[PDB]
Amino acid sequence: DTMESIVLNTIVTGLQKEFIARVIKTIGSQRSLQLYENAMKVENSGGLLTADMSRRKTIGGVFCYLLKQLVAEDQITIQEWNYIRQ
Amino acid sequence: DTMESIVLNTIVTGLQKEFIARVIKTIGSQRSLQLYENAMKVENSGGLLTADMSRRKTIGGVFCYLLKQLVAEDQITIQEWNYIRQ
Structure with a gap:
């Protein structure tokens, strides 16, 4: 620390x-x-679109999608995901 | 490691x-x-101006200049600098 x-x-x-x-404390x-x-x-590869496809996600949004991918792959628990998010 | x-x-x-x-192995x-x-x-605020009035506006150029300044500020010794430059 x-x-x-x-x-x-x-x-x-x-x-x-x-x-x-909270992410650091958890992973x-x-x-x-x-x-x-x-x-x-991902940003170097030209980013990702928002769900409405009107702009690129900011890099903050990319990091949140990736973090959420950690939950999908069972790397972070649901409880841990809730602690991180509020 | x-x-x-x-x-x-x-x-x-x-x-x-x-x-x-080598930077990492050094500092x-x-x-x-x-x-x-x-x-x-520094990049976010438009980079910098070197001693020769040469603009460093990209992150890499900025990063290089700040690294050299550590040498000029005696935070990296000459021997180390030589190790890093190759």
């Missing part, structure tokens, strides 16, 4: 703090960074 | 390998992310 302050701020700045603090700074990176790779 | 393998890929992805690896994962993060904030 000094490496976690740093991961915290890096991710926070990279996506444009408590919501990210660790290691898996958090991999998620930030993956969101960046 | 897995955290630093992940800091490696995060920073490489965000900058758009070997060069960044530590913690300080490298701080630097990557500071490069990001």
